[PDB]
């Protein structure tokens, strides 16, 4: 499909997936990208989106823009459904109206039933109720997948949905209270190692503090000590991770090689991932070993999510970046 000079729109280009798509496309020599910040183009606004498509006429679209659901903002139950449905509707429909050749949309494993068997098959859609916290976000993602398929059936569009669980990259936010599970664990174990070695000066520099008494209390409160790191929960819940370079790779592979006609007329979405999951305990141990911390884990007191990737494997794509290598890259970056 796409050539060097094809006009390619990446919606939500400043996010984790968006940034990875822009960087990988540029590295591969694609030099006709169209990018709009949130301030330039509000994707919830139908009139602004309609005018953009009419005036710019992109040939290919990667739809990465989202209001994401997590632990910190789970109260925004109405916003997760309204905003995500509007972004999906505005982009998908105006792509159709302006003769976009092909579009890739990203779904979430929260679209599958809370009690579904792992590994999750594409045909598990609608086989039971969704998890409570992510209920409205998951429902929006189902509607996005069904929208893509419905345009493909009625109008012969080529709009493909790729569904993933947890995304990470080399460059992460390591601020406490703001960091996801991998960067948070990495920083905890790095600090614990410094404590065990008696490197007071480096602790103060890492934390941006000038009083060690205050530093020791902050570490003690976040479960960090010279002998152990404290982990909330039993450590038994299992998670699958995909590196953003692998997300970019499969998205571009799909655009170039996988058409709607190859998938058929229900459950035509495609799961993506590495096909391997890890308990929180196993992840913590891997991080401990990469950092080189000589101490222990301690636990203080239930839905697993792992894709069945049989479909995408059958279509000729597999991941390159194993989780231990991805964590290693993140740690090297952190130390700069």
Ligand X SMILES: NC(=O)c1ccc[n+]([C@@H]2O[C@H](COP(=O)([O-])OP(=O)(O)OC[C@H]3O[C@@H](n4cnc5c(N)ncnc54)[C@H](OP(=O)(O)O)[C@@H]3O)[C@@H](O)[C@H]2O)c1
The candidate with the shortest Cα–Cα distance to 122, out of 252, 307, 316, 334, is: 307
**141 is known to lie in a ligand binding site:** yes
Which one, 14 or 320, has the nearer CB to ligand X? Answer: 14
Give which of a second copy, ligand X, none residue 150 binds (C-beta under 5 to 8 Å, depending on kind).
a second copy
Query: Which of 2, 8, 65, 258 touches ligand X (CB under 6 A)?
Result: 65
Instruction: Select from 65, 104, 147, 258 the one that contacts a second copy (CB under 8 A).
Output: 147
User: How far, in Å, CA of 135 to CA of 130, rounded?
Assistant: 5
139 binds, among a second copy, ligand X, none (CB under 5 to 8 A by kind): a second copy
Name the catalytic one among 30, 52, 106, 137: 137
Whole-angstrom Cα distance, residue 192 to residue 295? 8
Pairing of strands 60-63, 102-108: parallel
| Residues composing the chain | 336
Nearer to ligand X, 16 or 157 (CB): 16
Q: Site residues for ligand X, window 18-37 (CB under 6 A)?
A: 18
Q: Cβ distance 126 to 234 under 8 Å?
A: no
Residue placing its CB nearer to ligand X in the complex, 184 or 219: 184
Draw the binding track, 98-137, toward ligand X (x: CB under 6 A; -: no contact).
--------x-x-----------------------------
Residues near 92 by beta carbon (within 8 Å), at least 6 away in sequence: 63, 103, 105, 144, 147, 148, 151, 159
Active site residue 126: no
Extract the tokens encoding 101: 């050749």
Specify the DSSP element, H or E, that contains 151. helix 135-155
Of 185, 183, 165, nearest to 174 (Cα)?
Answer: 183
- The secondary structure element, H or E, covering residue 215 is helix 212-221
Pick the closer one to ligand X by CB: 14 or 236.
Answer: 14
> Residue 14, annotated ligand binder?
yes
Strand partners, 332: none
The residues carrying an active-site annotation are 137
Q: Which residues bind ligand X (CB under 6 A)?
A: 12, 14-18, 38, 42-44, 64-68, 87, 106, 108, 164-167, 173
Q: Which residues are annotated as a binding site for substrate?
A: 188, 232, 239
Which positions lie near a second copy, rule CB under 8 A? 45-47, 75-82, 85-86, 89, 92-93, 96, 113, 125-130, 132, 135-136, 139-140, 142-143, 146-147, 150-151, 153-155, 266
């Amino acid at each position: 499909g796409m050539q060097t000079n094809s006009k390619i729109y990446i919606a939500g280009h400043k996010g984790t997936a968006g940034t990875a798509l822009v960087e990988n496309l540029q590295k591969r020599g694609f030099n006709n990208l169209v990018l709009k910040t949130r301030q330039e183009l509000d994707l919830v606004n139908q009139q602004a989106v309609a005018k953009f498509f009419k005036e710019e006429k992109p040939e290919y679209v990667f739809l990465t823009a989202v209001l994401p659901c997590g632990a910190a903002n789970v109260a925004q139950r109405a916003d997760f459904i309204y905003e995500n449905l509007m972004i999906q509707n505005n982009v998908i429909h105006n792509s159709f109206l302006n003769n976009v050749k092909k579009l890739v949309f990203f779904g979430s494993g929260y679209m599958y039933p809370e009690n579904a068997k792992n590994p999750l098959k594409e045909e598990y859609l609608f086989q039971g109720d969704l998890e409570y916290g992510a209920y409205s976000f998951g429902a929006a993602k189902i509607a996005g997948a069904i929208m893509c398929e419905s345009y493909n059936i009625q109008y012969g569009t080529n709009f493909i949905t790729l569904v993933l669980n947890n995304l990470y990259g080399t460059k992460a936010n390591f601020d406490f209270g703001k960091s996801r599970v991998l960067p948070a664990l990495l920083r905890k174990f790095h600090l614990a190692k410094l404590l065990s070695e008696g490197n007071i000066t480096q602790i103060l520099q890492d934390l941006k503090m000038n009083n060690f008494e205050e530093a020791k209390e902050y570490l003690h409160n976040f479960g960090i000590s010279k002998k152990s790191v404290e982990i909330w929960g039993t450590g038994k819940v299992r998670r699958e991770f995909i590196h953003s370079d692998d997300l970019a790779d499969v998205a571009i592979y799909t655009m170039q090689n996988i058409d709607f006609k190859d998938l058929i007329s229900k459950n035509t979405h495609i799961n993506i991932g590495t096909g391997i999951d890890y308990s929180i305990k196993e992840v913590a141990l891997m991080v401990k070993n990469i950092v080189g911390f000589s101490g222990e884990l301690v636990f203080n007191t239930t839905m697993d999510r792992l894709m069945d990737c049989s479909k995408i494997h059958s279509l000729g794509w597999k991941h390159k970046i194993e989780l231990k290598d991805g964590i290693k890259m993140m740690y090297e970056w952190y130390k700069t």
